[PDB]
Amino acid sequence: AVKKFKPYTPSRRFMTVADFSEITKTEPEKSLVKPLKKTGGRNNQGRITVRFRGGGHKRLYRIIDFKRWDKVGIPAKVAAIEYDPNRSARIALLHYVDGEKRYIIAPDGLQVGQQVVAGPDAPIQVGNALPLRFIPVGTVVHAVELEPKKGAKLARAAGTSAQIQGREGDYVILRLPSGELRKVHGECYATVGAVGNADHKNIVLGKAGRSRWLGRRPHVRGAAMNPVDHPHGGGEGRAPRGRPPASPWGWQTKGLKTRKRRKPSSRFIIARRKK
Amino acid sequence: MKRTWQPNRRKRAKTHGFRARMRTPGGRKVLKRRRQKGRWRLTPAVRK
RNA sequence: UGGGAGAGGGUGGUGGAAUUCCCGGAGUAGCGGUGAAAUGCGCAGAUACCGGGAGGAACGCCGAUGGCGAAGGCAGCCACCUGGUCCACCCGUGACGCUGAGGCGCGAAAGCGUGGGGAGCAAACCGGAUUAGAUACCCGGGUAGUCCACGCCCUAAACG
RNA sequence: CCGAGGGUAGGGCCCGUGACUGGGGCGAAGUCGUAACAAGGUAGCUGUACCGGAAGGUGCGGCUGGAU
RNA sequence: AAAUGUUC
RNA sequence: GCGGGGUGGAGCAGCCUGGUAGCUCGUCGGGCUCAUAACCCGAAGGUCGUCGGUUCAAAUCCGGCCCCCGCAACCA
RNA sequence: GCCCGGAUCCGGGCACCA
RNA sequence: GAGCUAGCCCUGGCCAGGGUGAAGCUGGGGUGAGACCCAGUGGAGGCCCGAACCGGUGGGGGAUGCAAACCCCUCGGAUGA
RNA sequence: GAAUGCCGGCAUGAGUAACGAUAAAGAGGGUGAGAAUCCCUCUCGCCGUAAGCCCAAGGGUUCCUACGCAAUGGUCGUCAGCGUAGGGUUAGGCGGGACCUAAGGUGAAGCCGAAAGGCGUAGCCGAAGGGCAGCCGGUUAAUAUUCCGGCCCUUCCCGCAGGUGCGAUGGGGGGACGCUCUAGGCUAGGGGGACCGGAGCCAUGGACGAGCCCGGCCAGAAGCGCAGGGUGGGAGGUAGGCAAAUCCGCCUCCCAACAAGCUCUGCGUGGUGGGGAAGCCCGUCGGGUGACAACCCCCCGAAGCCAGGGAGCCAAGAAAAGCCUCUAAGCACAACCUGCGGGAACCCGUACCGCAAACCGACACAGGUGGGCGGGUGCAAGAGCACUCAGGCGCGCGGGAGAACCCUCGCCAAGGAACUCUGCAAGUUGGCCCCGUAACUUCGGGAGAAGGGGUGCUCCCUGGGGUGAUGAGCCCCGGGGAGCCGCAGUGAACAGGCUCUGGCGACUGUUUACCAAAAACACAGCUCUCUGCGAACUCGUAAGAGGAGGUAUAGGGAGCGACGCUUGCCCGGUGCCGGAAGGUCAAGGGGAGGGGUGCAAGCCCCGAACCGAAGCCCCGGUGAACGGCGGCCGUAACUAUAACGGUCCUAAGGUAGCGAAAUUCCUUGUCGGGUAAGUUCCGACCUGCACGAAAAGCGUAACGACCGGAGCGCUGUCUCGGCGAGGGACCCGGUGAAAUUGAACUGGCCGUGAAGAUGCGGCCUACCCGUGGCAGGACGAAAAGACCCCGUGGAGCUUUACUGCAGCC
RNA sequence: CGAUGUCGGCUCGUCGCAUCCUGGGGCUGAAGAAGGUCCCAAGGGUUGGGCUGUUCGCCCAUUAAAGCGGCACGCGAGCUG
Ligand SMILES: CC(=O)c1cccc(N[C@H]2[C@H](N)[C@@](NC(=O)N(C)C)([C@H](C)O)[C@@](C)(O)[C@@]2(O)COC(=O)c2c(C)cccc2O)c1
Ligand SMILES: [K+]
Ligand SMILES: [Mg+2]
Ligand SMILES: [Mg+2]
Ligand SMILES: [Mg+2]
Ligand SMILES: [Mg+2]
Ligand SMILES: [Mg+2]
Ligand SMILES: [Mg+2]
Ligand SMILES: [Mg+2]
Ligand SMILES: [Mg+2]
Ligand SMILES: [Mg+2]
Ligand SMILES: [Mg+2]
Ligand SMILES: [Mg+2]
Ligand SMILES: [Mg+2]
Ligand SMILES: [Mg+2]
Ligand SMILES: [Mg+2]
Ligand SMILES: [Mg+2]
Ligand SMILES: [Mg+2]
Ligand SMILES: [Mg+2]
Ligand SMILES: [Mg+2]
Ligand SMILES: [Mg+2]
Ligand SMILES: [Mg+2]
Ligand SMILES: [Mg+2]
Ligand SMILES: [Mg+2]
Ligand SMILES: [Mg+2]
Ligand SMILES: [Mg+2]
Ligand SMILES: [Mg+2]
Ligand SMILES: [Mg+2]
Ligand SMILES: [Mg+2]
Ligand SMILES: [Mg+2]
Ligand SMILES: [Mg+2]
Ligand SMILES: [Mg+2]
Ligand SMILES: [Mg+2]
Ligand SMILES: [Mg+2]
Ligand SMILES: [Mg+2]
Ligand SMILES: [Mg+2]
Ligand SMILES: [Mg+2]
Ligand SMILES: [Mg+2]
Ligand SMILES: [Mg+2]
Ligand SMILES: [Mg+2]
Ligand SMILES: [Mg+2]
Ligand SMILES: [Mg+2]
Ligand SMILES: [Mg+2]
Ligand SMILES: [Mg+2]
Ligand SMILES: [Mg+2]
Ligand SMILES: [Mg+2]
Ligand SMILES: [Mg+2]
Ligand SMILES: [Mg+2]
Ligand SMILES: [Mg+2]
Ligand SMILES: [Mg+2]
Ligand SMILES: [Mg+2]
Ligand SMILES: [Mg+2]
Ligand SMILES: [Mg+2]
Ligand SMILES: [Mg+2]
Ligand SMILES: [Mg+2]
Ligand SMILES: [Mg+2]
Ligand SMILES: [Mg+2]
Ligand SMILES: [Mg+2]
Ligand SMILES: [Mg+2]
Ligand SMILES: [Mg+2]
Ligand SMILES: [Mg+2]
Ligand SMILES: [Mg+2]
Ligand SMILES: [Mg+2]
Ligand SMILES: [Mg+2]
Ligand SMILES: [Mg+2]
Ligand SMILES: [Mg+2]
Ligand SMILES: [Mg+2]
Ligand SMILES: [Mg+2]
Ligand SMILES: [Mg+2]
Ligand SMILES: [Mg+2]
Ligand SMILES: [Mg+2]
Ligand SMILES: [Mg+2]
Ligand SMILES: [Mg+2]
Ligand SMILES: [Mg+2]
Ligand SMILES: [Mg+2]
Ligand SMILES: [Mg+2]
Ligand SMILES: [Mg+2]
Ligand SMILES: [Mg+2]
Ligand SMILES: [Mg+2]
Ligand SMILES: [Mg+2]
Ligand SMILES: [Mg+2]
Ligand SMILES: [Mg+2]
Ligand SMILES: [Mg+2]
Ligand SMILES: [Mg+2]
Ligand SMILES: [Mg+2]
Ligand SMILES: [Mg+2]
Ligand SMILES: [Mg+2]
Ligand SMILES: [Mg+2]
Ligand SMILES: [Mg+2]
Ligand SMILES: [Mg+2]
Ligand SMILES: [Mg+2]
Ligand SMILES: [Mg+2]
Ligand SMILES: [Mg+2]
Ligand SMILES: [Mg+2]
Ligand SMILES: [Mg+2]
Ligand SMILES: [Mg+2]
Ligand SMILES: [Mg+2]
Ligand SMILES: [Mg+2]
Ligand SMILES: [Mg+2]
Ligand SMILES: [Mg+2]
Ligand SMILES: [Mg+2]
Ligand SMILES: [Mg+2]
Ligand SMILES: [Mg+2]
Ligand SMILES: [Mg+2]
Ligand SMILES: [Mg+2]
Ligand SMILES: [Mg+2]
Ligand SMILES: [Mg+2]
Ligand SMILES: [Mg+2]
Ligand SMILES: [Mg+2]
Ligand SMILES: [Mg+2]
Ligand SMILES: [Mg+2]
Ligand SMILES: [Mg+2]
Ligand SMILES: [Mg+2]
Ligand SMILES: [Mg+2]
Ligand SMILES: [Mg+2]
Ligand SMILES: [Mg+2]
Ligand SMILES: [Mg+2]
Ligand SMILES: [Mg+2]
Ligand SMILES: [Mg+2]
Ligand SMILES: [Mg+2]
Ligand SMILES: [Mg+2]
Ligand SMILES: [Mg+2]
Ligand SMILES: [Mg+2]
Ligand SMILES: [Mg+2]
Ligand SMILES: [Mg+2]
Ligand SMILES: [Mg+2]
Ligand SMILES: [Mg+2]
Ligand SMILES: [Mg+2]
Ligand SMILES: [Mg+2]
Ligand SMILES: [Mg+2]
Ligand SMILES: [Mg+2]
Ligand SMILES: [Mg+2]
Ligand SMILES: [Mg+2]
Ligand SMILES: [Mg+2]
Ligand SMILES: [Mg+2]
Ligand SMILES: [Mg+2]
Ligand SMILES: [Mg+2]
Ligand SMILES: [Mg+2]
Ligand SMILES: [Mg+2]
Ligand SMILES: [Mg+2]
Ligand SMILES: [Mg+2]
Ligand SMILES: [Mg+2]
Ligand SMILES: [Mg+2]
Ligand SMILES: [Mg+2]
Ligand SMILES: [Mg+2]
Ligand SMILES: [Mg+2]
Ligand SMILES: [Mg+2]
Ligand SMILES: [Mg+2]
Ligand SMILES: [Mg+2]
Ligand SMILES: [Mg+2]
Ligand SMILES: [Mg+2]
Ligand SMILES: [Mg+2]
Ligand SMILES: [Mg+2]
Ligand SMILES: [Mg+2]
Ligand SMILES: [Mg+2]
Ligand SMILES: [Mg+2]
Ligand SMILES: [Mg+2]
Ligand SMILES: [Mg+2]
Ligand SMILES: [Mg+2]
Ligand SMILES: [Mg+2]
Ligand SMILES: [Mg+2]
Ligand SMILES: [Mg+2]
Ligand SMILES: [Mg+2]
Ligand SMILES: [Mg+2]
Ligand SMILES: [Mg+2]
Ligand SMILES: [Mg+2]
Ligand SMILES: [Mg+2]
Ligand SMILES: [Mg+2]
Ligand SMILES: [Mg+2]
Ligand SMILES: [Mg+2]
Ligand SMILES: [Mg+2]
Ligand SMILES: [Mg+2]
Ligand SMILES: [Mg+2]
Ligand SMILES: [Mg+2]
Ligand SMILES: [Mg+2]
Ligand SMILES: [Mg+2]
Ligand SMILES: [Mg+2]
Ligand SMILES: [Mg+2]
Ligand SMILES: [Mg+2]
Ligand SMILES: [Mg+2]
Ligand SMILES: [Mg+2]
Ligand SMILES: [Mg+2]
Ligand SMILES: [Mg+2]
Ligand SMILES: [Mg+2]
Ligand SMILES: [Mg+2]
Ligand SMILES: [Mg+2]
Ligand SMILES: [Mg+2]
Ligand SMILES: [Mg+2]
Ligand SMILES: [Mg+2]
Ligand SMILES: [Mg+2]
Ligand SMILES: [Mg+2]
Ligand SMILES: [Mg+2]
Ligand SMILES: [Mg+2]
Ligand SMILES: [Mg+2]
Ligand SMILES: [Mg+2]
Ligand SMILES: [Mg+2]
Ligand SMILES: [Mg+2]
Ligand SMILES: [Mg+2]
Ligand SMILES: [Mg+2]
Ligand SMILES: [Mg+2]
Ligand SMILES: [Mg+2]
Ligand SMILES: [Mg+2]
Ligand SMILES: [Mg+2]
Ligand SMILES: [Mg+2]
Ligand SMILES: [Mg+2]
Ligand SMILES: [Mg+2]
Ligand SMILES: [Mg+2]
Ligand SMILES: [Mg+2]
């Protein structure tokens, strides 16, 4: 579930935190962590290129295995389920019978101590990874590759999933978490089941400070600025937009589609997203 | 109150130093310029 | 002890008919709708027809003056978990009973909260009619909602 | 010491009264509609919700104290 | 089709 | 100061582009109804705010004047 | 200004303006 | 030119004392089981009071100043954005 | 001769202001030409979580000694951070380097860019992080973990012995990590002692006392003891740790696991080496003595040590080397490990200041400057507050006087906000313990609500804890009586005034460095929208980055702004979205038909229909997209008003809720409340000049150095002022500015004058020159008015101004 | 316009008189008392408060009376702001 607080401070009145029920190991695998290089939203020119970023808790990167097809037929045991501060999803620690240890994102229903495997021959079971073409049409699926051997790109967020809708040649048809209908190549791997920690979105940050812990610096409205800064800048007292609502760089921000029309992947998207 | 000059030897040598100047087209033009004017010091003095 | 009938309840799963939308084919001058019409939809190729797809909701015939439950109420089909209940036998306990202010639970619909879901339907709402008017009845649209999970609300011509 | 009571401070119940406001009752022959009673000219009532000058309408579910 | 009918 | 207006009883056309004033309602006379409303058939009523001027002719074009809406009235 | 349009002239279509 | 200032990055450091007493846990009560109630334990928090530290609210002084922004009295934050 | 001209020089203001914290001085004795100012002594005051002491920046000889006083020093100077000179900084162990990585920087390979250059995996560089071997004392005028003395330790090289498959930049382990809280045991540090050691002291009424006063330790190898950290052992299998591996990882079996063993730290002890006071002597910083100094017991006790300890929590907490292990080439007369021995051990820093007179502030400048130590007592605690130890200071002009006035301070009869824009300011209140505490509420709160009582000292009785031993002592919480004193017991210092009621913002936060701290920004939360990943978006010509080693429960953009209850109608215009038709549509295609030239083949030019994208037109959608949400006339059996109607217009005519409002012009609307009196305030009404629903609407507990209104308390705010204090002002000695200044021999009135006259006219008044004072004038000073206009002057900003460009299509 | 600081308050006044009071008068539709109205008169006097930034004004309570106006709408090298 999601844990609440009594209002013993103003902020604690609404703050909710994850329950951390599923977490079985409270420190990572030392040989699976490298330092995460905090950027502050700055690129190699030293320029902010994504505004309002920096100052969050220090983190260690946990190396996640987004291939899995790396180890076909070598089963693994789910040793523990751990916190990962770099993603919404929990991660599961795999002890391969090989003796290799790797991380995966923890699907919903994974129980520590169970056994998973990857490959065409694998059982259609929560935690296993197969190429899409060998997965029954209709099963829920996460950590999906988008092109063969290129890595799991789709459905990795807490609670998310994709569902296989049908097949057509070398391609299967997935419904992405967004509701889009895309053709994804059949030889692309995917782990059956949905990603765990579905309660993640029910979390109320509760106070300004919590956002700051997440490295999210305060966002300031255009309307709060001056004409030098933003299309919505200036005006005497409060002002309505007074033009079509715009980004700091001038382009319209209410409805203006921005996916490039002539994208080569257009042939593969059947139906643009849901709501 | 805290004023603008806050001496720091490493800062001084790394910013205005001989090697910093030589490392850049502008810096070399400075050195060229101060040599042409015949400055006694091409670069700010600093005790390392 | 042994047997019974049943839409009693909860969970999981699954089947076909229909409506809608989408894709393909084929086809053309209207379709729809009413008291009559208009709005609406249609040569930007609609209706009607065939194939494929997606999704949600309700389960036709059986079906009854029927069955079950304390009441609200419960209807495709399968399994699981579970309540009541009747009958046979005349085996066991020996009045252990009845009712029940408070208390506790349950309680159709609508409604509310947080997430999902959204085909059909449809408060509000828009339009077309009717009309003296028509903030209505009729027609074309259409949002909550109707559906699921969890938590509230605790009303009723909750009636025999 | 206790002590009538006086004084200070803060509560509780009650009563009178108050600009204005909310509906209620009553008032021989005001204004607008015609919701209900005959299938009352859309059967009615109903709990609820939303809406509308007003009666009321509509959705959802119920009831017959309805159909003939 | 068809709204309404002053009071005792 | 600048723009717009004034026409049957009411609310609005016509003016720009001179000659011929129109629409809904109201009012009046008939019908229908026991009667009333609605409905149906017919009809009256504006010399166009006022006074000037232009024109053969002015609701109409042009000037004053009387009203009536609107907008402005800022810098110390 | 010219060409493409309809029942000399309104349609319009593009373009020019010292 | 970022030795001032603004943001971020890496790596260290600092925050007297006192107050309030969340969750949890234990025991008791409760019930079919529960919820839940009670006491104890516990030690949460952009929680409270208040130094250092960071501020700069009001007033007064200063105004060729001690000072090109300072001093005094007050006053804000002070485990956190 | 003028340019607020330029450079220089010298005047005026002027013996004026000032001489830089109000912590404070007095005397005696030295020195010297000269002394308030230098040295010495005594007395006095100031700091003492410093105004004392270590360290790091930065500074760069300022350090020490001799000799100086021209200048520097806000005065003086014999003195000095000043002048001249001489001296002074000593390391294998401290800091940095010959070690390691962090961001970042650089950069074989590689990528990009007219040039210059930009990037870039490894690698290299990069520290206040990791790693690493020295502690105590003595010595110098000046250095000392550096020299010396004692006791210790590290690496490198060689050698001897013992031992082993030795061997690396490769594999693995370890290094290696957060926040808050916290156990045990120690140490640093502290308090006490009737015990130990000590020069002495008995005063002024008393005390020869268990009197007073001083001191009662520091370092220490191995071993030992205590306290802690780290850590399983064995076997078999093996496909993983880009080769190999006996290591590591995974599987199995065995044994044992709040132990132990092994190992490493801390602390104690410890051969030994040091230290060692008051006092009064000699000094004038130190010495000698004390002294064979003593070197003990009890208590308090860390935030520090064992430390990589423990628990809980979520926001989930560097790297790399040293080090250990595994093997690879290799090599196994080698090599490594262990013990011992001999030898070897480099470069740079080291003075001094360092919360300041030596750093940053032009100054010996009331400002700024990171880390550690920071004693005692008492006040609940404490780094707070008062006093005080060690130690350091009296702030580099003084002496007087005792005016106005100013500053900072103290008290005040009666009154008590009557002050004023405003209780501005200053009173009041004030800590702790106990009693007690309302509306409302989101059940936390509002709370320190409000309000009240207590508080010292003495004696008697007594409860529990720590330490020890279960006792004595010491220490820590209490409880109960009976008393004493004073005006008063947190007797000094430090330490809330309270309440009622509105506006705005939910809240903690943030902001215009240096006139605005707020109602502004942020904020959790809500919604819209874009984005399928080589994402969108952003920075860049690009490469490349950020986004993100993320993936729609995610990322960008926008508005709104906890929460509650809500968020209506308009899609005609603009925006965005959808629409394979139609309309227009550029280059290009096409080439009917015409032309220039040529004797000609030919060469060359113009060129219609038709084909031909996006965009625009056109058809729809869309409001938490830009935005918009009417007018006139009539009507109720009293008046008044209009539920109702008529009609024009609109894309549609403002719903709920609010309303004279941070919005109301008229306006101090009207009425009600509060006041003796209320342009403010609160509650209402509604013809809302000109509220209204995410530029959100109406509410909202709590919160606020926000802005209103009111009451109690208390006051020098005031009636209305008085007195007192200190620092200035004043006088004397020392030093001695400034802006300003056409020149000046610079009066009043009434006139006149370019319209406000010391300067002109007429009259009047007036001996010459100062000092303290006050500010009416000199259209006083300052600043080439910042308002306004002007200039075909400039810049920032905007858009459906013009015209380009990037970007996108 | 190479600067004449701008409302209101406060403080300090000083002048005018078209006199608010006090003093002296005439006329009165002046019985007395008390008023009206004009004349003479500037010596003195001319209050405290509620509201507002206010001047002004209204209001409370008084008063003999609660005067009006000039002085750069007197007065910021006097203060306030
Ligand atoms: C049969 C006949 O004459 C006729 C004509 C036209 C229409 C109709 N049918 C119906 C009329 N249009 C009516 N119904 C309707 O339109 N439907 C599609 C059912 C309307 C909603 O009110 C009705 C209920 O009034 C109606 O049933 C009769 O009422 C009147 O018509 C009506 C009213 C209400 C007032 C005056 C006249 C009328 O006709 C009937
Ligand atoms: K102006
Ligand atoms: Mg909560
Ligand atoms: Mg969780
Ligand atoms: Mg690592
Ligand atoms: Mg870089
Ligand atoms: Mg760079
Ligand atoms: Mg950005
Ligand atoms: Mg950023
Ligand atoms: Mg996670
Ligand atoms: Mg974070
Ligand atoms: Mg914002
Ligand atoms: Mg702004
Ligand atoms: Mg800018
Ligand atoms: Mg702009
Ligand atoms: Mg704007
Ligand atoms: Mg603005
Ligand atoms: Mg603004
Ligand atoms: Mg505005
Ligand atoms: Mg605007
Ligand atoms: Mg807006
Ligand atoms: Mg606009
Ligand atoms: Mg725009
Ligand atoms: Mg999509
Ligand atoms: Mg400077
Ligand atoms: Mg600095
Ligand atoms: Mg340096
Ligand atoms: Mg440095
Ligand atoms: Mg530096
Ligand atoms: Mg350099
Ligand atoms: Mg070169
Ligand atoms: Mg030079
Ligand atoms: Mg030279
Ligand atoms: Mg240089
Ligand atoms: Mg066609
Ligand atoms: Mg669907
Ligand atoms: Mg019963
Ligand atoms: Mg329901
Ligand atoms: Mg309609
Ligand atoms: Mg009708
Ligand atoms: Mg109507
Ligand atoms: Mg809803
Ligand atoms: Mg119910
Ligand atoms: Mg008495
Ligand atoms: Mg009826
Ligand atoms: Mg009805
Ligand atoms: Mg009916
Ligand atoms: Mg109405
Ligand atoms: Mg309706
Ligand atoms: Mg029904
Ligand atoms: Mg009627
Ligand atoms: Mg016209
Ligand atoms: Mg009859
Ligand atoms: Mg009739
Ligand atoms: Mg005519
Ligand atoms: Mg005429
Ligand atoms: Mg203007
Ligand atoms: Mg710096
Ligand atoms: Mg706490
Ligand atoms: Mg508190
Ligand atoms: Mg201040
Ligand atoms: Mg100043
Ligand atoms: Mg100060
Ligand atoms: Mg403070
Ligand atoms: Mg505080
Ligand atoms: Mg001349
Ligand atoms: Mg001059
Ligand atoms: Mg000049
Ligand atoms: Mg002089
Ligand atoms: Mg003078
Ligand atoms: Mg001075
Ligand atoms: Mg001074
Ligand atoms: Mg001095
Ligand atoms: Mg002297
Ligand atoms: Mg002398
Ligand atoms: Mg002195
Ligand atoms: Mg001396
Ligand atoms: Mg002390
Ligand atoms: Mg102190
Ligand atoms: Mg000298
Ligand atoms: Mg001399
Ligand atoms: Mg001298
Ligand atoms: Mg000097
Ligand atoms: Mg001197
Ligand atoms: Mg000086
Ligand atoms: Mg001498
Ligand atoms: Mg040595
Ligand atoms: Mg060497
Ligand atoms: Mg190195
Ligand atoms: Mg290195
Ligand atoms: Mg470097
Ligand atoms: Mg280092
Ligand atoms: Mg070292
Ligand atoms: Mg030595
Ligand atoms: Mg070995
Ligand atoms: Mg780690
Ligand atoms: Mg570290
Ligand atoms: Mg020790
Ligand atoms: Mg002590
Ligand atoms: Mg192996
Ligand atoms: Mg290998
Ligand atoms: Mg000695
Ligand atoms: Mg001796
Ligand atoms: Mg440690
Ligand atoms: Mg935490
Ligand atoms: Mg070999
Ligand atoms: Mg050999
Ligand atoms: Mg060397
Ligand atoms: Mg050398
Ligand atoms: Mg050296
Ligand atoms: Mg040294
Ligand atoms: Mg310091
Ligand atoms: Mg000094
Ligand atoms: Mg300065
Ligand atoms: Mg000095
Ligand atoms: Mg100083
Ligand atoms: Mg205290
Ligand atoms: Mg002094
Ligand atoms: Mg004197
Ligand atoms: Mg007094
Ligand atoms: Mg009082
Ligand atoms: Mg009083
Ligand atoms: Mg007052
Ligand atoms: Mg106090
Ligand atoms: Mg409560
Ligand atoms: Mg109290
Ligand atoms: Mg006493
Ligand atoms: Mg306080
Ligand atoms: Mg705020
Ligand atoms: Mg604010
Ligand atoms: Mg400021
Ligand atoms: Mg400013
Ligand atoms: Mg500035
Ligand atoms: Mg500024
Ligand atoms: Mg200020
Ligand atoms: Mg503030
Ligand atoms: Mg804000
Ligand atoms: Mg919300
Ligand atoms: Mg760009
Ligand atoms: Mg990344
Ligand atoms: Mg806002
Ligand atoms: Mg629209
Ligand atoms: Mg449209
Ligand atoms: Mg539109
Ligand atoms: Mg073309
Ligand atoms: Mg096109
Ligand atoms: Mg809206
Ligand atoms: Mg519009
Ligand atoms: Mg409006
Ligand atoms: Mg509406
Ligand atoms: Mg409504
Ligand atoms: Mg109002
Ligand atoms: Mg009012
Ligand atoms: Mg007003
Ligand atoms: Mg006004
Ligand atoms: Mg009104
Ligand atoms: Mg809005
Ligand atoms: Mg409000
Ligand atoms: Mg509430
Ligand atoms: Mg509020
Ligand atoms: Mg509130
Ligand atoms: Mg606040
Ligand atoms: Mg505030
Ligand atoms: Mg007030
Ligand atoms: Mg006074
Ligand atoms: Mg004095
Ligand atoms: Mg004299
Ligand atoms: Mg001068
Ligand atoms: Mg002259
Ligand atoms: Mg002269
Ligand atoms: Mg003279
Ligand atoms: Mg004149
Ligand atoms: Mg004159
Ligand atoms: Mg004169
Ligand atoms: Mg003359
Ligand atoms: Mg004369
Ligand atoms: Mg005279
Ligand atoms: Mg003067
Ligand atoms: Mg003057
Ligand atoms: Mg003046
Ligand atoms: Mg100036
Ligand atoms: Mg100039
Ligand atoms: Mg000028
Ligand atoms: Mg100027
Ligand atoms: Mg002007
Ligand atoms: Mg011009
Ligand atoms: Mg001109
Ligand atoms: Mg210009
Ligand atoms: Mg410009
Ligand atoms: Mg773009
Ligand atoms: Mg001027
Ligand atoms: Mg001047
Ligand atoms: Mg001037
Ligand atoms: Mg008289
Ligand atoms: Mg009389
Ligand atoms: Mg007088
Ligand atoms: Mg006034
Ligand atoms: Mg007024
Ligand atoms: Mg009188
Ligand atoms: Mg003046
Ligand atoms: Mg005037
Ligand atoms: Mg004036
Ligand atoms: Mg005046
Ligand atoms: Mg003035
Ligand atoms: Mg002033
Ligand atoms: Mg003034
Ligand atoms: Mg002046
Ligand atoms: Mg004055």
From Swiss-Prot, chain A:
What GO molecular function annotations does the UniProt record carry, in alphabetical order?
rRNA binding; structural constituent of ribosome; transferase activity
Q: Where is this region: Disordered?
A: 222-275
Record's compositionally biased regions (Basic and acidic residues): 229-239
Single Gene Ontology BP annotation: cytoplasmic translation
One cellular component term from this protein's GO annotations in UniProt: large ribosomal subunit
Gene3D superfamilies xref list: 2.30.30.30, Nucleic acid-binding proteins, Ribosomal protein L2, domain 3
**What are the UniProt keywords, alphabetically?**
Ribonucleoprotein, Ribosomal protein, RNA-binding, rRNA-binding
- InterPro entries from the UniProt entry: NA-bd_OB-fold (IPR012340), Rib_uL2_dom2 (IPR014722), Ribosomal_uL2 (IPR002171), Ribosomal_uL2_bac/org-type (IPR005880), Ribosomal_uL2_C (IPR022669), Ribosomal_uL2_CS (IPR022671), Ribosomal_uL2_dom3 (IPR014726), Ribosomal_uL2_RNA-bd_dom (IPR022666)
Q: Where is the composition biased (Basic residues)?
A: 256-275
| SUPFAM superfamilies xrefs | Nucleic acid-binding proteins (SSF50249), Translation proteins SH3-like domain (SSF50104)
Is RNA-binding one of the keywords UniProt gives this record?
yes
Subunit composition?
A: Part of the 50S ribosomal subunit. Forms a bridge to the 30S subunit in the 70S ribosome, contacting the 16S rRNA. May also make transient contacts with protein S6 during translation in the 70S ribosome.
Tell me the PANTHER family matching this sequence. Answer: LARGE RIBOSOMAL SUBUNIT PROTEIN UL2M (PTHR13691:SF5), RIBOSOMAL PROTEIN L2 (PTHR13691)
UniProt record similarity statement: Belongs to the universal ribosomal protein uL2 family.
This chain's function reads: One of the primary rRNA binding proteins. Required for association of the 30S and 50S subunits to form the 70S ribosome, for tRNA binding and peptide bond formation. It has been suggested to have peptidyltransferase activity; this is somewhat controversial. Makes several contacts with the 16S rRNA (forming bridge B7b) in the 70S ribosome.
Q: What is this protein called?
A: Large ribosomal subunit protein uL2
Organism of derivation: Thermus thermophilus (strain ATCC 27634 / DSM 579 / HB8)
From Swiss-Prot, chain B:
What is one GO cellular-component annotation here? Answer: ribonucleoprotein complex
Q: Which UniProt keywords apply?
A: Ribonucleoprotein, Ribosomal protein
* PROSITE patterns per the UniProt record, alphabetical: RIBOSOMAL_L34
The segment annotated Disordered runs over: 26-48
Instruction: List GO molecular-function terms, semicolon-separated.
Output: structural constituent of ribosome
One Gene Ontology BP term is: translation
- Which stretches does UniProt call biased (Basic residues)? 29-48
Q: What does this protein do?
A: Found on the solvent side of the large subunit.
- Other comments on record: The open reading frame (ORF) for this protein is entirely within the ORF for the RNase P protein (RnaP). The two start codons are separated by four nucleotides.
Family label: Belongs to the bacterial ribosomal protein bL34 family.
Describe, as the record does, how this protein assembles with itself and its partners: Part of the 50S ribosomal subunit.
Q: What name does UniProt use for this protein?
A: Large ribosomal subunit protein bL34
Query: Could you tell me which species this protein originates from?
Result: Thermus thermophilus (strain ATCC 27634 / DSM 579 / HB8)
